[PDB]
């Protein structure tokens, strides 16, 4: 029986009815070019990996109207995926939209926690697996589950929804330097200065599915980053222990490492447990809460094992083809030992930004191609993504202090490098080329609709500006 404390990470869950069956849905948001919260299912996990990373919130503050959450407290929920804050927005007749904003000033980002039943009282400690009611301080409406146009949405309304809080991680008891569920990391043969990765961003989607080890500069690039995702929901951010099963998500392409007898990255929808579950072992020799920390970054030598087969993740020596292909084998090599290395928050965020940008721009491009031959043409998301991307690359305002300026400048070079290495310049150029097929905003509108026509020039101007950001000194 555990209590919630600040700096704890949680998923907010509600129960809904789908195909006449109660399914538990999780509160989620992206925050890259979309601010609105939505709902993420945890169904069929034995066959479809859940996307827990967009659903995860950190309990940042908790006060009277690390500290234990009490009923009656106002709390501030930091979305882990974006660094933005759950808030009651002023858009939507009597409901408001719920989403993310940067600004924690004002009452909009604050939520009071209330008993679901007489079982709990104000000032009492919030227990893990207590069903909560959450009230917006700014609007006095409940965090609410609603039905509309054949789907479930989240809004702020004067009707109640019970939310359960599932604990993910507890930052106040996360041992420093140890592997934690949901970590973004690299996997290295340190002696070889090689890391586990996939072919570069100048190859197409189907060409980017194969996995190999590569030395040199990839060890600071986005394509060598992986997210480790455990099989459980509750305590998905607990310490990883030897032999505990997990999936490895390739961040920059979103695909999951899978065994067919070859290794291949597979779409979410194809990523079943038997083919995608691996574990760390400390050699190849024949619970609830954070748990005991066991696997140390930099220090532990780790062997990756496929669970259903027992086979070892290993390499194929180069025959007398430069790079060593990743393969599965019952013996492997005496120097198979992986050294784990934790991703910096910056490169980690940038890799996630790139993967959602690529996904959105690819939809945009496919929409444009369909126009020139029921079309999905996300003009609004494209426009907002481009505004966030241009902010992401904003040069430090000349008014900042020295080290504050130098740190932003260092961060900017890293973002530019990572984007460039993932082929983002050519992606931006391909969007420009497709929009340039049109003579004018009116030409585009005649074909794609008024709204599209009214964003043609502004999207183009943003693409040009982003391009300039992607190459400036």
Swiss-Prot record:
Question: Post-translational modification, briefly?
Answer: Channel activity is modulated by phosphorylation. Phosphorylation is increased in failing heart, leading to calcium leaks and increased cytoplasmic Ca(2+) levels.
Q: Where in the cell is it found?
A: Sarcoplasmic reticulum membrane
Residues of the MIR domain = 66-116, 123-168, 176-231, 237-286, 292-343
The organs and tissues expressing this protein are described as: Highly expressed in heart, lung, cerebellum and brain. Detected at lower levels in adrenal gland, stomach, thymus, esophagus and ovary.
* Effect of loss of the gene: Embryonically lethal. Embryos die at about 10 dpc, due to defects in heart tube development. Cardiac myotubes display enlarged rough endoplasmic reticulum and cytoplasmic vesicles that contain high levels of Ca(2+).
The entry assigns this protein to a family as follows: Belongs to the ryanodine receptor (TC 1.A.3.1) family. RYR2 subfamily.
Show the domain comment: The calcium release channel activity resides in the C-terminal region while the remaining part of the protein resides in the cytoplasm.
What do we know about how this protein assembles, alone or with others?
A: Homotetramer. Can also form heterotetramers with RYR1 and RYR3. Interacts with CALM and S100A1; these interactions regulate channel activity. Identified in a complex composed of RYR2, FKBP1B, PKA catalytic subunit, PRKAR2A, AKAP6, and the protein phosphatases PP2A and PP1. Interacts directly with FKBP1B, PKA, PP1 and PP2A. Interacts with FKBP1A and FKBP1B; these interactions may stabilize the channel in its closed state and prevent Ca(2+) leaks. Interacts with SELENON. Identified in a complex, composed of FSD2, CMYA5 and RYR2.
Main function: Cytosolic calcium-activated calcium channel that mediates the release of Ca(2+) from the sarcoplasmic reticulum into the cytosol and thereby plays a key role in triggering cardiac muscle contraction. Aberrant channel activation can lead to cardiac arrhythmia. In cardiac myocytes, calcium release is triggered by increased Ca(2+) cytosolic levels due to activation of the L-type calcium channel CACNA1C. The calcium channel activity is modulated by formation of heterotetramers with RYR3. Required for cellular calcium ion homeostasis. Required for embryonic heart development.
Protein name, as recorded: Ryanodine receptor 2
Native source species: Mus musculus (Mouse)
Name of the gene: Ryr2
Q: Which span of the parent protein is shown here?
A: 11 to 543 of 4966
